[PDB]
Design an enzyme around this catalytic site. Sequence first.
Site, PDB file in Angstrom:
ATOM      1  N   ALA A  27       1.029  -1.039  -0.015  1.00  0.00           N
ATOM      2  CA  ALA A  27      -0.212  -0.052   0.041  1.00  0.00           C
ATOM      3  C   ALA A  27       0.865   1.194   0.002  1.00  0.00           C
ATOM      4  CB  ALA A  27      -0.776  -0.072   1.344  1.00  0.00           C
ATOM      5  N   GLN A  50       2.301   1.855  -3.487  1.00  0.00           N
ATOM      6  CA  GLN A  50       1.311   2.251  -4.474  1.00  0.00           C
ATOM      7  C   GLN A  50       1.127   3.754  -4.026  1.00  0.00           C
ATOM      8  OE1 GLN A  50       0.501   0.029  -6.651  1.00  0.00           O
ATOM      9  NE2 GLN A  50       0.976  -1.758  -5.772  1.00  0.00           N
ATOM     10  N   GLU A  60       4.129  24.285  13.338  1.00  0.00           N
ATOM     11  CA  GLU A  60       2.732  24.827  14.148  1.00  0.00           C
ATOM     12  C   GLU A  60       1.946  23.679  14.008  1.00  0.00           C
ATOM     13  OE1 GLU A  60       3.794  28.338  15.250  1.00  0.00           O
ATOM     14  OE2 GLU A  60       1.956  28.717  14.357  1.00  0.00           O
TER      15      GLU A  60
HETATM   16  N1  LIG Z   1      -5.104   2.364  -0.045  1.00  0.00           N
HETATM   17  C1  LIG Z   1      -4.716   1.094  -0.362  1.00  0.00           C
HETATM   18  N2  LIG Z   1      -4.586   0.077   0.264  1.00  0.00           N
HETATM   19  C2  LIG Z   1      -3.951  -1.126  -0.064  1.00  0.00           C
HETATM   20  C3  LIG Z   1      -4.051  -1.142  -1.609  1.00  0.00           C
HETATM   21  N3  LIG Z   1      -3.363  -2.682  -1.742  1.00  0.00           N
HETATM   22  C4  LIG Z   1      -3.703  -2.961  -0.558  1.00  0.00           C
HETATM   23  N4  LIG Z   1      -4.067  -2.249   0.361  1.00  0.00           N
HETATM   24  C5  LIG Z   1      -4.254  -2.821   1.800  1.00  0.00           C
HETATM   25  O1  LIG Z   1      -3.121  -3.723   2.303  1.00  0.00           O
HETATM   26  C6  LIG Z   1      -3.676  -4.872   2.765  1.00  0.00           C
HETATM   27  C7  LIG Z   1      -2.824  -5.778   1.976  1.00  0.00           C
HETATM   28  O2  LIG Z   1      -1.499  -5.397   2.102  1.00  0.00           O
HETATM   29  P1  LIG Z   1      -0.632  -5.362   0.584  1.00  0.00           P
HETATM   30  O3  LIG Z   1      -0.184  -4.067   0.627  1.00  0.00           O
HETATM   31  O4  LIG Z   1      -1.504  -5.770  -0.710  1.00  0.00           O
HETATM   32  O5  LIG Z   1       0.398  -6.398   0.644  1.00  0.00           O
HETATM   33  P2  LIG Z   1       1.796  -6.021   1.582  1.00  0.00           P
HETATM   34  O6  LIG Z   1       1.800  -6.391   2.777  1.00  0.00           O
HETATM   35  O7  LIG Z   1       2.338  -4.615   0.976  1.00  0.00           O
HETATM   36  O8  LIG Z   1       2.773  -7.230   0.889  1.00  0.00           O
HETATM   37  P3  LIG Z   1       2.542  -8.789   1.221  1.00  0.00           P
HETATM   38  O9  LIG Z   1       1.661  -8.950   2.072  1.00  0.00           O
HETATM   39  O10 LIG Z   1       3.938  -9.548   0.801  1.00  0.00           O
HETATM   40  O11 LIG Z   1       1.484  -9.055  -0.432  1.00  0.00           O
HETATM   41  C8  LIG Z   1      -5.347  -4.878   2.464  1.00  0.00           C
HETATM   42  O12 LIG Z   1      -5.711  -5.114   3.700  1.00  0.00           O
HETATM   43  C9  LIG Z   1      -5.486  -3.571   1.791  1.00  0.00           C
HETATM   44  O13 LIG Z   1      -6.505  -2.967   2.778  1.00  0.00           O
HETATM   45  C10 LIG Z   1      -3.814   0.033  -2.325  1.00  0.00           C
HETATM   46  O14 LIG Z   1      -3.536   0.093  -3.561  1.00  0.00           O
HETATM   47  N5  LIG Z   1      -4.280   0.964  -1.702  1.00  0.00           N
END
Ligand SMILES: Nc1nc2c(ncn2[C@@H]2O[C@H](COP(=O)(O)OP(=O)(O)OP(=O)(O)O)[C@@H](O)[C@H]2O)c(=O)[nH]1
Lengths: 426, 428, 328
Positions: free
Chosen positions: B11, B14, B243
């Site tokens: 996340a 991204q 601030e």
């Molecule tokens: N805002 C947002 N949240 C995300 C996104 N992708 C996943 N999430 C959140 O992150 C959680 C899953 O984690 P991921 O980021 O998909 O995977 P990671 O923990 O980064 O890496 P792995 O666990 O190895 O796959 C989920 O519960 C989602 O709510 C995204 O593109 N945007």
Amino acid sequence: REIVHIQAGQCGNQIGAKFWEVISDEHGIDPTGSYHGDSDLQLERINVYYNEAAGNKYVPRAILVDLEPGTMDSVRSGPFGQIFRPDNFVFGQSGAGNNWAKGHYTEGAELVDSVLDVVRKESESCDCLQGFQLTHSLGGGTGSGMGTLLISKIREEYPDRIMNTFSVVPSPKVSDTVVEPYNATLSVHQLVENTDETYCIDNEALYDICFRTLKLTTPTYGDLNHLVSATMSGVTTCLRFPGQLNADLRKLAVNMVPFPRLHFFMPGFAPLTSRGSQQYRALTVPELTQQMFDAKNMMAACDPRHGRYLTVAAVFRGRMSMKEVDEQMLNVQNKNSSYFVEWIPNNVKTAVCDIPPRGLKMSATFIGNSTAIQELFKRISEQFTAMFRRKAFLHWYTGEGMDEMEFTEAESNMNDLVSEYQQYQD
Amino acid sequence: RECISIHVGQAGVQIGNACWELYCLEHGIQPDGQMPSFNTFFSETGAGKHVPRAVFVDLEPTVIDEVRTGTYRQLFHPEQLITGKEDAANNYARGHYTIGKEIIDLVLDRIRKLADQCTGLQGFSVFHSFGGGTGSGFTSLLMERLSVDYGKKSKLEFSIYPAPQVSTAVVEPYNSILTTHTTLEHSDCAFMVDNEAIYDICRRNLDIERPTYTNLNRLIGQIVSSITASLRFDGALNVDLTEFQTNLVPYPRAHFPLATYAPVISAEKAYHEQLSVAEITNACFEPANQMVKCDPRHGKYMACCLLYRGDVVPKDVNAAIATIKTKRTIQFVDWCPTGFKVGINYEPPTVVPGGDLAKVQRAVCMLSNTTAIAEAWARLDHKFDLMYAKRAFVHWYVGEGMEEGEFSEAREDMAALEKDYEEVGVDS
Amino acid sequence: EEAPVRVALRVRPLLPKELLHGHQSCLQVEPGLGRVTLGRDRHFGFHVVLAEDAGQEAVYQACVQPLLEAFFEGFNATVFAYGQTGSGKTYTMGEASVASLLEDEQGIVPRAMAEAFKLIDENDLLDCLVHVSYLEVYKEEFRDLLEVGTASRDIQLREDERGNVVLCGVKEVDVEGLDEVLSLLEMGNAARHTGATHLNHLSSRSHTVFTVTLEQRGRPGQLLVSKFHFVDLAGSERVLKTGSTGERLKESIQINSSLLALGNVISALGDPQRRGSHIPYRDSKITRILKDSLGGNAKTVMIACVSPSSSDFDETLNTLNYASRAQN
Ligand SMILES: Nc1nc2c(ncn2[C@@H]2O[C@H](COP(=O)(O)OP(=O)(O)OP(=O)(O)O)[C@@H](O)[C@H]2O)c(=O)[nH]1
Ligand SMILES: Nc1nc2c(ncn2[C@@H]2O[C@H](COP(=O)(O)CP(=O)(O)OP(=O)(O)O)[C@@H](O)[C@H]2O)c(=O)[nH]1
Ligand SMILES: Nc1ncnc2c1ncn2[C@@H]1O[C@H](COP(=O)(O)OP(=O)(O)NP(=O)(O)O)[C@@H](O)[C@H]1O
Ligand SMILES: [Mg+2]
């Protein structure tokens, strides 16, 4: 980042033949070793299931084991056999005669040594081994006995690696040989300890699926094994491609293990529809969910609605948004709240790969763990107690030197497993 | 006067993609790295190229190398995209302790190098999750280290909060609590956001039926931009992050504000209304636009800050402020006479090409420290309760070197936090 | 007819390396009333507690003597050494210290052996012979001490239709004279050491298992038999997550997991409040080999040893909590 494949016993052997065929078609590999694809994404992660050899050729990280040459000759004569290198076709010249004691205990060690050598060599040729996946039978001699011995030895060699396997479980309505329950019991006693997790598939449920849902009247081994291969490819398609979440095995492992000892799973695959109806359907997330939840689509011969689900994981393939799939799973969890355990809120976990399977715009695979599967183990125990009571043809196994004590211990452990499933069930 | 960008967890990375797209589009930086034409986010080379003062880190290479193969590969320096070779698999012990301690060094050195490149470090931002493995433990570890080495520098974080309904990991409660301890320990100001609220917002006010992560991430990037570029780019009344620490911290522990943005309008919805500052300011406080599954009306308010982009006249701001003060049932705690901060920038908000938001001539982001957040905690704890009721999955963590005593103490600490929110909520 | 397993608690005496380094006995032993307090109010109730210097024969006549008595009850008795590394457990059961200067070096093992033999020196009527087994488990794998080495797959547990523990593959040695006992224990220690890999510094790496086996059947016929066990688990280095790190950390993590497994097992005895189903025994080797030692008609006592300082104060809390619910 590399996973090594292992196939023992004719069943699992041709199953893996189909499976490797599936993966090859996936990554666009010809039956000769040349690459013919459209996207670099077929190549980006080719390491997970292949090593590279000069001339732009690719070798499957494959090892084939058996006790009869003709099966290996057959699979070699089939398409993509040349893709295998002969250095991996390890086999004897004498069948185990469906004798766990013969295959596991006495005759196996000979091939065990060489195959373990090959495992070591191939593993260290790779960079970072992820785990191993097996495909064999639990009622037959070879794939049960040598499978158990080999997996025990590997787990000894690699204490912390991922050990997952697919193994076919017998059914009362397709039983072939009388020795079925004994092999089942011993295989189970070894799997429950020397392995991280397992998948259970039965020819009965497969017959049902291909017969009714595919409207097929002449089901061959090909289509059953084809579906099993589709499942096996799905469970890692996430890893083999860019995605959104949860591409890893160990991820699924910790997601699906509410307790160390309870690591049995039923798989399911979707969409599955006879070609006559394919002109009607509308492949959406709700449709996929209604397919996967239904007990009519469970690869195991057990109706889940008699038990309650402990853990559920669903992997999706194709261009789909999150909101749809998550709200769909929420609704599913709502409407059928009885079949879930309050122990864990949100009993469902998801994973989304961005690549669809060739031919369908999207697809879904599901893996579940619910105490309901315990009933199938009764199918063993009773049968077991049905024969062990009379010591019926116990003499075959006594000859190889195994003692009653081993059967006794295996039976007790199976009882314990059933009891613990009933504990957690309530 | 420069800032640092860190992205851990999927996340997080991204979010990084999103915010960096937004930035380069804010200042004509073509994805090749060139900018044929604001240097607190980018260090500049003599070649006319610019590098974003950022780092991407995750234990599983796939997403990082995907970034390395996307369009913006030439924007980044290969020294920055540091990756491991085995992810945390939703396990705090692995990311924090077992594995991440084998990558922490290189990324720490890169942070220190970026600091030495910077002249005056104003602070840095963090993006990660409470549910995923990598974005949970490793983040705690890194924060621990940086609080040892740098300290007084500002530590800003954006945690993606695991939604009560939509969930991706069985151990989301566990990771969330174990991260909660550390973020209490060393963070400065936390803006935790939920997916569900964003989903409701876009499906209702942005008018999308199938929200993809791209849209939510574009929203969050817009948020952080309106937060910081509002001060990095010139405006009327710049109100610094220091601030922010002064205003949004009534007490060393009550540092958990919520973030909200307005307007969220589609193309067609943009016409058929002329948007005054009054209407948007009114809209800022409805729970239907709040970015946390929580009820502001139910809770009471402690501190509020509003930052504006575009054309804004302070007099109308005063008018709208008076309206908000007199109209709503917003229970300002007597321990605050007036907790309104207002900031105005002149840079109008920019639209992302192919984005889902219509261009607006004026926009507001609202930060608010309020007691209502306590609600959310109970849920997790209760959920956590059931899990710790049977000690399911705990084998995976002791199997990686954690102590159930840590679970107990962490629950007690979170209980102390929420109970302290309750106490300071109590008027005298 | 199961009398709940009796408990026993001893405290280890400190060393100047801690006496002059801020360590003090924050606890509060009370042997006369049989209780122990911690801090200022943590008075816990143990029907048997010990001092910090009670002799090996003292603690023997305290607890072991009823066990040597009931050794002929035709039902098995057991005892386990529980706690942290460096917590005197090796000295508590009093083994692996062969100097014979004052018999307070060596404790439970040689004293119990000598007293058993002296009870044989007087009664030799029935048909009753006793042998011993002395192995180790490490990395969740078996490795006998009496045996120099054998692959794990051979040496195994076994469960009969009667539902009793059986051990296969282990080397068996029957005992007839105390010299044999001392020599075999010496060589067994010398072929295992504090652990399978001896240790970083000479204290409690692996889990040492031992068993005395003498049949006195229910009277050629009804085979009602009492056996005994000498089990010394490893240390419970919890707060030293910041300590042993790296290869040694992985070395210790497995024993840590096994200890927590055992704790999970023992926890579900005095807690049937919510759906009191059966006990998860077969999870791990230790739990298997001790399942018989609990409930039914088998006899057992326990021993724990803590440190006076408040460094592992939390670990003292953990041990005390675990030993509290030890009822049945
Ligand atoms: N805002 C947002 N949240 C995300 C996104 N992708 C996943 N999430 C959140 O992150 C959680 C899953 O984690 P991921 O980021 O998909 O995977 P990671 O923990 O980064 O890496 P792995 O666990 O190895 O796959 C989920 O519960 C989602 O709510 C995204 O593109 N945007
Ligand atoms: N679903 C499928 N099941 C199969 C297929 N072929 C075999 N089987 C099942 O597997 C069983 C036979 O498989 P195997 O010959 O590999 C058993 P094994 O090799 O261990 O015995 P030996 O060859 O005598 O050592 C049989 O009972 C079938 O029900 C197949 O193509 N598909
Ligand atoms: N109650 C005690 N009586 C005599 N010596 C003790 C006592 N407690 C600790 N010691 C000394 O402190 C050291 C630590 O105890 P040790 O014998 O290593 O037991 P341990 O730490 O449990 N390791 P081990 O028993 O070998 O698994 C020993 O060398 C003893 O000499
Ligand atoms: Mg066969």
